[PDB]
Symmetry: C2
Subunit: 233 residues, 2 copies
């Protein structure tokens, strides 16, 4: 399974091992003033989004065939999938049974430590984490499903058939994996969680809208561009 | 020289429904049933209720002495930037939060449950503000001044900001004197204005969400106020 192996490898290299989990800012209990934020909460919010986008862009460059799509198409796919991938990956790696968010750099933060920057959104992502975890999606299936989040039709693709071919290829790889484990239907079960995920993408845009309104610190330009480019209207 | 106070009271009273003219024909305490998500009729109603205050507030403003002596561009700017705030403040003062009753400027009366789907959490925030405002027991003349102060205020991009400031001055003086005639109370009334700006923000959040959802688009005038008033 050579595409599968490459996908797994790209996934594992885009995230921290248990070895490299960074507890240096983690606090088991903080006492926040809920419903408000300060500049450092907002900057950290954006820094975490920024750091994830860089990691995702490197992950994507490892999905065989992706780096040969047009540069515009690469950028388009990445922007339209970014928040969904940030959420899905964060949920898959976090430990909601401990209130722990684990970000792609290895940084661990307690839910209470994310409350001011993220608002309600982080408590919602942790709920989806529990929902996702109860499906018991294995790493290779996740490696495929995450790639399929990114490699998908989008309005404005220059070469939509080449994206569709790559989507076909990954979906076949996934099908062959789930057969091999079995020795198509949990799929239905997993797709049942998609509305929760979509709602979460929306909530992310809602949070960024609010923070832009408030403007304690501006979003970094690359995030701001994703926000603006993905607003239908 | 109030006179100004009387003119402000008059503009306020002429801009809202007579108790005689309240319409309860659509009012229902009970709704069948709520869970879950907003549908197209909830969203159309949201925008219809907002759009109902447009003309009314514009005509009110034109009766504030001195407002029609600001530049036409400054008039339009003031009205756009204050619109949500005035809608909220006027709705909060007119309504009966103890009963969950919203009274709109057309006279239409709706229960909070009939609004909640379209408005979201914002309607509860508005009703919390309404209960707070009611506890202040703001009299009509004080309210006539307060509302005017919401409109006649510094905004970015005014052509004649000092003339805005003079008229605001005049109105604030009028209010201060009125309150003396009938400082702790004044600062308390005036402390409602920042709360009102927070509620305007929650309104912009609601419209942003609805525009994202796109079941029914905002009407052009509301869409314009929304886009024009994003300071980014």
């Amino acid at each position: 399974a050579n595409l599968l192996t490459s996908l797994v490898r790209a996934h594992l290299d885009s995230g921290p091992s248990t070895a490299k989990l960074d507890y240096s800012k983690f606090q088991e209990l903080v006492l926040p003033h809920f419903g408000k934020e300060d500049a450092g909460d907002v900057q950290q919010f954006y820094d975490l989004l920024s750091g994830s986008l860089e990691v995702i862009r490197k992950w994507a460059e490892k999905i065989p065939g992706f780096a040969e799509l047009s540069p515009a198409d690469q950028d388009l796919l990445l922007e339209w999938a970014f928040l969904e991938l940030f959420i899905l990956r964060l949920a898959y790696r976090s430990k909601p049974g401990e209130g722990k968010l684990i970000f792609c750099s290895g940084l661990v933060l307690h839910r209470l430590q994310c409350a001011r920057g993220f608002g309600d959104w982080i408590d919602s992502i942790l709920a989806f984490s529990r929902s996702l975890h109860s499906l018991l999606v294995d790493v290779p299936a996740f490696a495929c499903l995450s790639a399929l989040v990114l490699i998908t039709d989008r309005h404005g693709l220059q070469e939509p058939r080449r994206v569709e071919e790559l989507q076909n290829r990954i979906a076949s790889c996934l099908k062959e994996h789930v057969a091999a484990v079995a020795g198509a239907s949990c799929l239905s079960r997993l797709l049942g969680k998609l509305p929760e995920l979509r709602t979460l993408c929306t909530q992310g845009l809602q949070r960024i809208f609010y923070l832009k309104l408030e403007d304690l610190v501006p979003p970094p330009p690359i995030i701001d561009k994703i926000f603006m480019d993905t607003l239908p209207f």
